[PDB]
From a paper:
The protein SidK, secreted by Legionella pneumophila, interacts with the V-ATPase to inhibit acidification of the phagolysosome in the early stages of infection. V-ATPases pump protons across a phospholipid membrane using energy from the hydrolysis of adenosine triphosphate (ATP) to adenosine diphosphate (ADP) and inorganic phosphate. Successful pathogens can subvert host defenses by secreting effectors that target V-ATPases to inhibit lysosomal acidification or lysosomal fusion with other cell compartments. This study reveals the structure of the V-ATPase:SidK complex, an assembly formed from the interaction of host and pathogen proteins involved in the infection of phagocytic white blood cells by Legionella pneumophila. Removal of the C-terminal residues 415–573 of SidK did not significantly affect V-ATPase inhibition by the SidK mutants, but truncations of the N-terminal region of the protein has been demonstrated to prevent V-ATPase inhibition. These data show that binding of the N-terminal domain of SidK to the V-ATPase is responsible for its partial yet specific inhibition of V-ATPase activity.
In order to understand how SidK interacts with the V-ATPase, purified full length SidK (residues 1 to 573) and detergent solubilized and purified intact V-ATPase from S. cerevisiae were incubated together and the resulting complex analysed by cryo-EM. In the absence of ATP, V-ATPase adopts three distinct conformations that correspond to different rotational positions of its rotor subcomplex relative to the rest of the enzyme. Particle images were subjected to 3-D classification in order to separate these different conformations of the V-ATPase, as well as different occupancies of SidK binding to the V-ATPase. While V-ATPase particles decorated with SidK were found in all three rotational states of the enzyme, the highest-quality cryo-EM map was obtained for V-ATPase in rotational state 1 fully decorated with three copies of SidK and reached a resolution of 6.8 Å. The distribution of particles in the different rotational states differed slightly from the distribution observed in the absence of SidK: 49%, 23%, and 28% for rotational states 1, 2 and 3 with SidK bound versus 47%, 36%, and 17% without SidK bound. The fitting shows that SidK binds the V-ATPase A-subunit primarily via its first α-helical bundle (blue bracket) and the three copies of SidK each interact mostly with the corresponding N-terminal region of one of the three A-subunits. Surprisingly, comparison of the V-ATPase:SidK3 and V-ATPase structures revealed no major conformational rearrangements in the V-ATPase upon SidK binding. In comparison, the C-terminal region of the ‘open’ A-subunit in the V-ATPase:SidK3 cryo-EM map is well defined (yellow densities, and 4B, surface versus mesh), indicating a more rigid structure when SidK is bound.
Author numbering:
A (entry chain S): 17 to 163
B (entry chain Q): 1 to 345
C (entry chain R): 1 to 213
D (entry chain b): 400 to 423, 427 to 480, 524 to 560, 567 to 658, 710 to 808, 816 to 829
E (entry chain a), G (entry chain Z): 11 to 158
F (entry chain c): 5 to 61
H (entry chain Y), I (entry chain T), J (entry chain X), K (entry chain U): 9 to 158
Write the structure that this text describes.
């Protein structure tokens, strides 16, 4: 009956990491009042990238909640892997979102400073964004073999 | 901690600084105002800003110097002394120490002005923690060291001028205003790094440390250039000694603080900035305003941080000094020297 | 069981120090008490051959109330951030005193998010939700309800803090008045769906209201 | 705002004062104190004193109508005050239909106007009308004369949580057995309603704006669940104010009527001042706490029409 | 049998939040009252708005005291701690936001009268969390005594 | 008998505000009685008969 | 039987809150007393208003101490800890709010002599939390049984 | 547990001695700092340290009175009211000394400038002993209401 | 058995994801020189995030190996052998990511004046990745003997 | 008697030695710092350390008296009154020393320019031993009520 | 106790990787900061990162040797040498990396202005590896003495 903590622990940290990254990413949109050519379409890439990270933890918590049932073998000891499988995607999503917000805070001003420097911020945002995808893939592979 | 920043008492000062941050002028406003030669176009263009609210109540017909002092005193008193009464927590002590860093030098300048046969009730345009008639006239008119300790001890909280007053009272550095002004100027930079070291890792604090190190190196370059042929004492407290985590070490800053004009520390510190090792006082003084004005846009892009409130006082002081220097040259119909030479206010 | 008074005294003692941490502190524990309890707690796990683990039981149903209090604290953490920006602007210009209430509407809806889940989490007068480990077996429902309530309360508390920070950043709407502030309002409005989607996922993850058997 | 062809909305004058009285016979003192402004309207027109008395004196007609409806709404609620489970199933179903009727009546004027405001109104009103129509129709069908059936179910939003989970919907306890095809047809119409809403947006513009059109596309679906989730504030303040008034009022009438004799008349007479003072303090606390209807009606009412200008124009509409 | 901590925690958290909100509102009210004494009645709205949260914890503690009898059960000692802890945390957060919103609302409303609607609107929104927590504590307290 | 009969009598017996008012501001006076009658029709408050929940206690 | 720590915790928390409020009240009273000697009697009301909070926990502990005998039960040692903890936290929060309210009231009343009614009215309203917690502790003490 | 009631007897004198020591240190710091500015009112300003130092006599007399009635063995009934009365007396003496320290330092610093504030500082400082007297009275009643010693 | 050992899978990618998160977070912050024509310094300044990003795949490989070696039926040999291997690669990966995060800010800050320290910073990051590579090698060697648990 | 019976003997001398060491350090710092400006207060500064040593001597005598009544076995009721009296005497000596050191350093620093507060600092230092005497009396009564162990 | 010998093998590489990363971060920061002054001293300042990075091989080889000798049956005295040897080698490598970081930062800071202390900084930093070598030898002896199988 302890497998629900791993199910809630994925979205509980993924929602806090996505909210904490979306807050710091949205806080950098104040400076400096330039939205004629492309605003606001270039700053929404990191907000959408940090916003899409919670869907993996929500789908992982939905699949982990739907997978837990009393009609299968889950006693002694099926629920042990769900805590690490949910905590890995939760800590990976929060750690990815926390650096994603600070990277988007400077990437928002980097697009307004130069219109040709978005490839570096997108390349750093992809490498800082793939950590949640690796933990989501490991949580999906862990939840696939779970009963 | 890096990735999230927020405070309970810091939200009121950050929200109050965010309302006045929308009215802050940019370099394009000073560049467009410096191109105009008419006083009515410069006063009408400058009247539609945050500093223009005090000028909207009383307009200038001849561009006198008293209007810039009255507008700077009303804007600095309303924008500075108003948030001090409703403040609380450690942010009010940090902002009180930040106002005490310039108030310690202003109290020494008023103390030397009282001995210089100057007025004991007149105050100039500058950042101060209190008004010009509550604490400045008692410490300025008072020449005894006992009244200066009681005047600083009567205020809340304590300032760093009380600890520096014992060194000048003991006669440990000099009997002039230069040797006490050097340690009094370095004492605010040491106290700001001392408070930023204690309350440092609440925010990220990345651009504020580089701007504080560049301001400390710029103050050490001006202190080294000021003591050239002025009989500077290396053993006495007249040399700037401040550590920096930038492209320079503390021993290079201590050697650059002496009157030698070391271009090796300036060349090793930066290779693309204005300060590179040149001995020109006009280029070094003009480059200090553009270099000190830089890095405030990165601190002004965040919320719930003390770096934007710390840089907002220097940006407001640089904007008030640029508007006061531009108003005197624009009032006399003369071309600006520091305003026309520099490109970032 | 015996863990009821320990969880209640630990929740009260943790909420007291956690509430007194942000405000003016009048009582707090020393820093050596955590290392002393961690050394004595970790020292008994090594010796001897006995292993330490958790005990299966629900032990309380107040997780929905703690989730509603976490959502109310999340809305209250953003409403002060919006009022600090509105009162921070104040009389500096003739602008709207209710134009920043769009983030305060989502922050006020963040308090209903989880509070509606507290009424939806009754399960037909739930003193016990089902046959649990108090006099029977199969207590996974009552133990799993607290994690869903605390997860939905943490999601609503994070969404209220994010919507409050987006509203407080959308209060001034810029660092230089040269353009419209609707770009910050678009990013602030883009995060309001996390509370509704997190409350729908938290309500769907908790299951329906089963009868108390 | 105060544009031509006034006023700035029909449903604000009736939804504002009618919805303001739903948070509250404690309303008899509010109607009695509100009735002084009718006779004192001419003499109290030019006072020029106070910051809250001026704004309260400006809305004399809205405060008179809201104070007049407070007696009926307060006297109607204050079903049962013993249990806190039977009154919530009726207040939730009353505030659900009351919020959906004001939402559909407020969206009918914006859909009928057609003046951001271009599109998203002709193709809409299908998913929210199907969900809210199937919930209010299930509550109205469940409120008939009966019965051999379930109790506490649904009582509202739980049935909406059961919707969108299965095609053959048979969730309880409040549901219509004639028939369950409205959930499958409402799921098919809600599933097909998504492409037709956003598909007609770029077609009308052609003979950035893409994020504004997408935010305006999802703003209706987010605003429907935001309004439906925000509709519980009418029943929440009523259920909290009724127990908060009867709880403090219940500890004074029992000890007052228990005494007798010559000292019991002065003891009950002196004890009645705390009962009347708490009874007026509860209605004054609910009336002071009922200020959310101005922002909710100013946001939801002004959102479908097109700040303080519509609220000032609503008070100036009844004067001229 | 630990239902007393739920009844004491509601008045403790509501008393702490109402005390901090009354202190933070009285500090800005006393600081704004030194400028003009006529604005004391206009600036007195934050203390009256913050002081209304104590009645919810008092009535919730009265209902928790009325619902606490001679019965001893493990299920009867969990709902009171959740309702009292939720009403205490909601009143503490509502008073904590109402104090800082009341001080800045009174200080900003003292200079310009246009910010009174923003300060009253921001300060009035804090009572909804305490009312929702009091309604949740009343709904949980109503189902606590059912004979088991 | 039913609660729908009150709204049927209010809707059927009601003219719907056409017109029964002056030619100046007839939209507010016409739409006011429909909203007041709509709230008065929604002010039933039966609270019993299949979901009259309170029995014990 | 462990109600002794709850019986002493009300007077301990009330004495700690009364001392913490008396420190901040005496700081602002000593700072405002240097202006004029007539303001001492006007500023002395916050210390007397803050000192009245100790009588609730002292009378609650003195009244709860009389019902302690040889025969006791485990059920009779839980309500006294919750009522004493609620009265202690309510007295500590009321003293903590009364300290900042008394210091802000004396500081605002030091400059203008017309703010004494506002400082006394704002400071007098903060004592309702200790009276509500003392009433809840009185109802919890009256609802106790099986001990003496 | 026999002899478990000694923690209430030691905690009252420990908390009262610590609060009286902190109040005497805080009063002596402000008295020594205020004595340099004006040494005429040193004897008037020295009253708060001696008045703050007398708070330990209540916990010492309560610990001596509880120690005078204690034998070598005790039941579990005395070790619940004894620790509560001793903890209440110790917390009341520690809070009274902690308030008397800042009240004595602020009263000495405020009374150093103007001599008319000594009556207000003595009147406000004299009210701090009510918490220690109420805690000593509650500890005396709780100690007198005990039995089954041995 | 006890069913203990499943925390080693998330524990490997936890510190590795936190080290790469703090590394890319602290490396992404920093101003650079701007101009109309790019000097190719933008391609040189992105080397720290790409060099620090290998720790997530290095911990993800050991977490995938321990997750595949976990199985539906756990044993004490594979469970005890699987635990502890993730913390070694996660600690070295978090330390190397924390050092690369601090080196990335000094490299991007020093790249504005003169972009010649990329040869030293690339060898510093390449010498910093060996601590995470040794922990990943030790995690692979510890995960190699975890199979065939009885 | 289960265990932890010897801690009350060292608990008094630990806090008394720490308090006397901090008070002697705080008195010697102000004495050595004030001896440079004025050499008249040099001999007067020995009263704080010489009077401070009696509090450590009382805790050493109480530690010797509690150590002599221990042996190799503890009683059932000795391990509560022993640790309570030891903790009370240690906290009283540490609070007396810490309260005495700041007043001695502040008085010695303020009495350098003009000795007027020497009778006040000697009056407070002469009356500061009441906490150590009360804690020594309470520790003597608690130690006297715990004899005959075994 | 139980079979938990993997924490001793992971703690050596964790502590050695943390100390080597902490020294390599401060070495690369001072090398990147000193590289902007003169490009001739860039290759000379890279010796402290490569010299500091060699300390992780002792804890990695000790963790590999302890991992290769991990048994299946664990006793009370059986699984004790691995945690002490790995904690000793990890603490020695962390202390040697912590001293090598400050020695490398002081050497690069001294050689930054005028380079004369390159052989002095290399000679002073060369002696810091003796503590990690002795701790790696004691961890190798304690790890080699754990394989008993009693």
């Amino acid at each position: 009956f302890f497998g629900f903590a791993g199910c809630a622990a994925a979205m509980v940290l993924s929602c806090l990491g996505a909210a904490i990254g979306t807050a710091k990413s949205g806080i950098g949109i104040a400076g400096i009042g330039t939205f004629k050519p492309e605003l606001i379409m270039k700053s929404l890439i990191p907000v959408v990238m940090s916003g899409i990270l919670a869907i993996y933890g929500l789908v992982v918590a939905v699949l982990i909640a739907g997978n837990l049932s009393p009609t299968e073998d889950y006693t002694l000891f099926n629920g042990f892997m769900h805590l690490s499988c949910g905590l890995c995607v939760g800590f990976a999503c929060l750690s990815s979102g926390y650096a994603i917000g600070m990277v988007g805070d400077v990437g928002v001003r980097k697009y307004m400073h130069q219109p040709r420097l978005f490839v570096g911020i997108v390349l750093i945002l992809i490498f800082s964004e793939v950590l949640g995808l690796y933990g989501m893939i490991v949580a999906l592979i862990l939840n696939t073999r779970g009963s | 901690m890096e990735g999230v920043y927020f405070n309970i008492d810091n939200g009121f000062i950050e929200g109050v600084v965010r309302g006045y941050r929308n009215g802050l002028l940019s370099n394009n406003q000073y560049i467009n105002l410096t191109q105009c030669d008419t006083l009515e176009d410069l006063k009408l263009q400058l009247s539609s800003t945050d500093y223009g609210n005090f000028l909207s109540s009383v307009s200038s017909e001849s561009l006198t110097t008293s209007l810039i002092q009255e507008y700077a005193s009303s804007k600095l008193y309303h924008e500075f002394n108003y948030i001090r009464d409703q403040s609380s927590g450690s942010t009010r002590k940090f902002m009180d120490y930040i106002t005490y860093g310039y108030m310690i030098d202003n109290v020494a300048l008023m103390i030397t002005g009282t001995i210089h046969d100057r007025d004991k009730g007149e105050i100039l345009q500058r950042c101060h923690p209190l008004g010009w008639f509550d604490t400045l006239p008692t410490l300025s008119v008072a020449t005894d060291l006992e009244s200066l300790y009681e005047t600083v001890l009567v205020d809340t909280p304590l300032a760093p001028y009380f600890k520096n007053c014992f060194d000048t009272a003991e006669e440990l550095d000099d009997m002039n205003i230069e040797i006490i002004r050097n340690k009094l100027y370095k004492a605010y930079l040491e106290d700001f790094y001392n408070f930023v070291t204690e309350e440092i890792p609440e925010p990220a604090k990345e651009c504020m440390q580089t701007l504080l190190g560049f301001e400390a190196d710029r103050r050490s370059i001006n202190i080294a250039l000021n003591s050239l042929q002025s009989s500077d004492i290396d053993p006495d407290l007249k040399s700037d000694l401040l550590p920096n985590i930038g492209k320079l070490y503390p021993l290079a800053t201590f050697h650059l603080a002496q009157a030698q004009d070391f271009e090796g520390v300036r060349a090793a510190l930066a290779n693309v900035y204005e300060y590179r090792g040149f001995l020109e006082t006009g280029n070094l003084e003009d480059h200090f305003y553009q270099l000190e004005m830089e890095l405030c846009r990165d601190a002004f892009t965040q919320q719930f941080a003390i770096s934007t409130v710390w840089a907002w006082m220097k940006s407001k002081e640089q904007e008030v000094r640029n508007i006061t220097w531009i108003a005197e040259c624009i009032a006399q119909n003369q071309r600006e020297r520091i305003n026309n030479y520099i490109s970032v206010y | 069981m015996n863990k009821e008074s320990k969880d209640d005294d630990m929740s009260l003692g943790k909420f007291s120090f956690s509430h007194f941490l942000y405000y003016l502190v009048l009582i707090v524990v020393i820093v050596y008490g955590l290392y002393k309890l961690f050394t004595g707690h970790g020292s008994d796990i090594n010796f001897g051959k006995f292993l330490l683990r958790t005990s299966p039981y629900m032990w309380a149903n107040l997780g929905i109330a703690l989730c509603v209090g976490l959502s109310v604290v999340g809305a209250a953490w953003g409403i002060f951030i919006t009022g600090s920006s509105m009162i921070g602007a104040g009389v500096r210009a003739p602008r709207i005193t209710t134009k920043n209430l769009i983030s305060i509407i989502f922050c006020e809806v963040v308090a209903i998010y989880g509070l509606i889940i507290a009424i939806v989490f009754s399960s037909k007068l739930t003193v016990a939700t089902a046959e649990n480990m108090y006099s029977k077996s199969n207590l996974y429902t009552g133990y799993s309800l607290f994690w869903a309530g605390i997860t939905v309360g943490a999601s609503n508390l994070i969404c209220g803090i994010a919507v409050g920070i987006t509203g407080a950043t959308a209060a001034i709407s810029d660092a230089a008045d040269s353009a419209l502030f609707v770009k910050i309002l678009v990013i602030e409005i883009f995060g309001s769906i996390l509370g509704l989607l997190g409350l729908i996922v938290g309500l769907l993850m908790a299951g329906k209201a089963s009868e108390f058997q | 705002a105060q544009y031509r062809e006034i006023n700035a909305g029909l449903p604000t004058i009736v939804t504002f004062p009618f919805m303001f009285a739903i948070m509250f016979g404690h309303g008899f003192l509010m109607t009695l104190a509100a009735l002084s402004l009718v006779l004192n309207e001419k003499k109290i027109n030019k006072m020029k004193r106070g910051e809250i008395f001026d704004m309260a004196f400006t809305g004399r007609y809205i405060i008179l109508l809201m104070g007049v409806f407070s007696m009926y709404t307060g006297f109607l609620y204050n079903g049962t005050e013993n249990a806190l489970l039977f009154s919530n199933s009726y207040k939730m179903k009353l505030s659900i239909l009351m919020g959906f009727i004001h939402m559909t009546y407020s969206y009918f004027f914006s859909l009928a106007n057609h003046l951001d405001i271009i599109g998203n109104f002709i193709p809409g009103l299908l998913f929210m009308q199907g969900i809210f129509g199937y919930l209010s129709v299930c509550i109205v069908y469940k409120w008939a004369v009966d019965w051999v059936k379930d109790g506490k179910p649904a009582p509202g939003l739980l049935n909406m949580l059961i919707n969108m989970f299965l095609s053959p919907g048979t969730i309880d306890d409040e549901l219509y057995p004639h028939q369950a095809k409205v959930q499958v047809f409402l799921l098919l119409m809600a599933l097909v309603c998504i492409p037709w809403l956003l598909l007609v947006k770029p077609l009308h513009f052609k003979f950035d704006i893409m994020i504004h059109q997408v935010i305006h596309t999802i703003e209706f679906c987010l605003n429907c669940v935001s309004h439906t989730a925000s509709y519980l504030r009418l029943w929440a303040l009523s259920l909290a104010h009724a127990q908060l008034s009867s709880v403090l009022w219940t500890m004074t009438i029992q000890i007052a009527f228990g005494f007798r004799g010559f000292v019991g008349v002065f003891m009950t007479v002196a004890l009645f001042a705390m009962w009347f003072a708490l009874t007026c303090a509860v209605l004054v606390l609910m009336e002071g706490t009922s200020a959310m209807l101005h922002s909710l009606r100013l946001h939801w009412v002004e959102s479908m029409s097109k700040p303080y200008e519509p609220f000032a124009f609503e008070y100036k509409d009844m004067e001229v | 049998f630990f239902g007393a901590i739920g009844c004491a925690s509601a008045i403790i958290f509501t008393s702490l939040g109402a005390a901090y909100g009354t202190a933070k509102s009285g500090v800005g009210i006393c600081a704004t009252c030194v400028l003009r004494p006529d604005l004391l009645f206009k600036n007195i709205v934050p203390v009256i708005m913050a002081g209304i949260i104590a009645i919810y914890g008092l009535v919730v503690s009265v209902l928790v005291c009325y619902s606490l009898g001679q019965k001893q059960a493990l299920y009867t000692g969990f709902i009171q701690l959740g309702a009292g802890l939720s009403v205490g945390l909601s009143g503490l957060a509502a008073g904590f936001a109402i104090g800082i919103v009341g001080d800045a609302g009174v200080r900003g409303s003292s200079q310009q009268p246009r910010l009174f609607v923003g300060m009253i609107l921001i300060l009035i929104f804090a009572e909804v969390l305490g009312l929702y927590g009091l309604i949740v504590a009343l709904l949980l307290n109503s189902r606590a005594t059912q004979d088991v | 008998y039913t609660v729908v009969g009150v709204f049927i009598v209010v809707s059927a017996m009601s003219v719907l505000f056409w017109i029964m008012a002056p030619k100046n501001n007839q939209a507010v006076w016409r739409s006011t009685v429909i909203l007041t009658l709509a709230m008065m029709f929604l002010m039933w408050a039966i609270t019993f008969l299949c979901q009259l929940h309170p029995l014990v206690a």
